[PDB]
Request: fold
Amino acid sequence: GLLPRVNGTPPPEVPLADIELGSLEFWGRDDDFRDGAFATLRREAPISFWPPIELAGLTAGKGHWALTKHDDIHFASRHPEIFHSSPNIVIHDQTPELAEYFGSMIVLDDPRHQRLRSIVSRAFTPKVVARIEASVRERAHRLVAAMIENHPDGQADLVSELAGPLPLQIICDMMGIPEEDHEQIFHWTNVILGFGDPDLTTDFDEFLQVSMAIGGYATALADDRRVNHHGDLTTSLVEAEVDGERLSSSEIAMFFILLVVAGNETTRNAISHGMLALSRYPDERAKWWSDFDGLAATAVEEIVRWASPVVYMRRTLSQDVDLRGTKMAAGDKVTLWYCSANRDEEKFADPWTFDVTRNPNPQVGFGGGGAHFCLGANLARREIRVVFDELRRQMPDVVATEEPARLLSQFIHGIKRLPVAWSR
Ligand code: HEM
Ligand SMILES: CC(C)=CCC/C(C)=C/CC/C(C)=C/CO
Reply:
């Protein structure tokens, strides 16, 4: 069952000597240990250097400076000329020749970044956006209704039945991907997302083959829309133009590959962590369920602060930096620990309280601001609002019944399984 926890309980005090950000065992510990570790770093070692996680037998790469304070993360995000996103935003890129293939605009600095982001942004036309909005509601409604039809027992895993499929179905709908191709897209996406996680033991050759197959699918989808225009994002991406520059089909494919990761597992984990928090703190569910539209904006923003689905993003210094008196050298890696910034005692009153009315809420779960600020933030907020709306309408007493099975990850605050139950 759910471990009892009172809303507002701080994490345990974790001694500095017990914190090993380069240790896989550390990332396997519960959230209360992790949160207490970052609280210790914020108080005692707010900028500190760490080795990467080393998987024995594979190259590890160089270490990184951990920024744990909201102010430092915000500063780094606002200075992309010093804190570069190229070559990649993870601590150690396992496939650096494919950094742009999987990363699209997220691994680019200006001027390349602004050009690609500007063209992609222009493709989100009013008609495309209106279809996306209808899709969010339709998909969330259908998935919750199917959970009821498929489980007369009133019990299901929220991840497989709802939080997992919703964000990827929305991405498929916006790309104009036929219903008949969903199973293939889901399979390829799952293999890609599953590679950095052990269990099932994900084979690199299979990972490379599926990565090329989904890329080839997307290039062919884009080429089809060059000939046959439709009212989807794929067609608007082929037609968009900034300063005479348009996107090639392989640029569109790389942006699609970014989406099925960045727009997908993040939202999934915001949903699962939101359902978990609403189950642990039933007063907050009651408040939201009593004034759903009125509290939606603050409730969703609190779910994102609480979940921080993206644990960190990595930058690389283009020049020496001295901040908080800590000297970091050009070429060093720097990590922005949003999970920590979203608990910074200097910015949030009562940071350990999950409060669906929280205002202000300067949360940085979509990043600290600036050039790379999540392109889909308002879409993510809509997905979260709409899915909880559909749960409230169709199964208002739905509740998590067990502690989640946690993903072992430094980068994603992941829930692999979340049992829930509901009545009429
Ligand atoms: C709760 C869900 C989500 C979270 C927590 C999240 C978080 C993030 C973060 C932390 C970044 C990097 C920001 C930075 O470096 O300053 C980012 C970038 C991005 N996200 Fe999201 N994201 C979410 C959902 C989405 C969705 C739904 C989409 C679209 C389907 C999306 C598309 C993108 C793109 C395209 C970028 C790269 C933007 C750039 O590099 O200019 N994300 N997101
Ligand atoms: C989670 C967000 C916001 C973006 C994802 C970018 C990402 C997962 C890069 C992974 C780098 C890598 C080793 C890719 C091989 O798939």
Summary: The CA atoms of residues 260 and 352 lie 32 Å apart.
